[PDB]
Design an enzyme around this catalytic site. Sequence first.
Site, short mmCIF file in Angstrom:
data_model
loop_
_atom_site.label_atom_id
_atom_site.label_comp_id
_atom_site.label_asym_id
_atom_site.label_seq_id
_atom_site.Cartn_x
_atom_site.Cartn_y
_atom_site.Cartn_z
N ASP A 39 0.81 -1.22 0.00
CA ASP A 39 0.00 0.00 0.00
C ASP A 39 0.86 1.29 0.00
O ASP A 39 1.89 1.35 -0.66
CB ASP A 39 -0.94 -0.03 1.22
CG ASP A 39 -2.32 0.52 0.91
OD1 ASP A 39 -3.29 -0.26 0.89
OD2 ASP A 39 -2.43 1.74 0.68
N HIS A 69 -3.79 5.89 3.95
CA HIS A 69 -4.51 4.72 3.44
C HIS A 69 -3.91 3.40 3.94
O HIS A 69 -4.62 2.53 4.44
CB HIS A 69 -4.53 4.77 1.90
CG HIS A 69 -5.46 3.79 1.25
ND1 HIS A 69 -5.03 2.57 0.77
CD2 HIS A 69 -6.78 3.86 0.96
CE1 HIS A 69 -6.05 1.93 0.21
NE2 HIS A 69 -7.13 2.69 0.33
N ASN A 161 -14.23 -0.02 -6.56
CA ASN A 161 -15.27 0.89 -6.07
C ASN A 161 -16.06 1.57 -7.19
O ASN A 161 -16.44 2.73 -7.06
CB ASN A 161 -14.65 1.97 -5.16
CG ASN A 161 -13.87 1.39 -3.95
OD1 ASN A 161 -14.33 0.47 -3.26
ND2 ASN A 161 -12.68 1.93 -3.71
N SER A 224 -11.42 -1.22 -0.23
CA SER A 224 -10.14 -1.12 0.46
C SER A 224 -10.23 -1.41 1.97
O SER A 224 -9.27 -1.88 2.54
CB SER A 224 -9.52 0.27 0.27
OG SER A 224 -8.96 0.43 -1.02
#
Length: 279
Positions: A39, A69, A161, A224
């Site tokens: 990430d 994130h 998404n 996520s």
Amino acid sequence: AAQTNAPWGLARISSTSPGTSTYYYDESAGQGSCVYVIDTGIEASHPEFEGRAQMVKTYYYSSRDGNGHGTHCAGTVGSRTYGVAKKTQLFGVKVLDDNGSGQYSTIIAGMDFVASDKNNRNCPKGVVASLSLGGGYSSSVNSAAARLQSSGVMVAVAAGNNNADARNYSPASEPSVCTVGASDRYDRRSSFSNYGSVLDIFGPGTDILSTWIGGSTRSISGTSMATPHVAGLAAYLMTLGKTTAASACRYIADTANKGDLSNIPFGTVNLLAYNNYQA
Ligand SMILES: [Ca+2]
């Protein structure tokens, strides 16, 4: 063991019904297993990680999470208060920049890195990799995901998404890994969640409270946030010896809550991750 007033997502994966607030889990809590979070990095010094997190690889000027994130996702895997597997070991691999963007060549390199690096670590209960990222279809990105899975790592990836069929996204569309959809606290499909036949399982993804950079916390939404719930759950079950890296995704599907989600399109599984805990 029991955590009262838990985040709704942790409560949800240890219950057969929505609306509860306690997280029930076995004390072993993923001890002995390792999870790579691939990430924007991890703020390893965050008190919530209790010293169980570290950066092992970066592809940019620094290894620090300047975005948040990665730190959020890692917290859902195994922070003390916000995590599924509260005693697991966390390893950070920074393939995304501080704007949350990354080249597909860099993402592929990070996956090949984990396949090799795991041979240098002490992870007697097994290895998990959590990938909360993705983009348009690419057979090179899929193939790297499949290599990582084949080398003996449990691979979990976000469905995406776009409220669309995940077959046009990578690595979501690689069938051999574990592709994760998102649900909300009322057992509805998250309005943004991708769907389709390539999905394996759903996890809590809307309004997920977790760790953030600057030693703080915040609530955000996305596939996520659902992916690390499942990565955490796999590490937890591997420590308990219920399943292995090769078959963890299927074991989670077999033992899931079935038929309880609403707004699932025909041809998409109706399965919600569930730890089957019994005191
Ligand atoms: Ca799959």
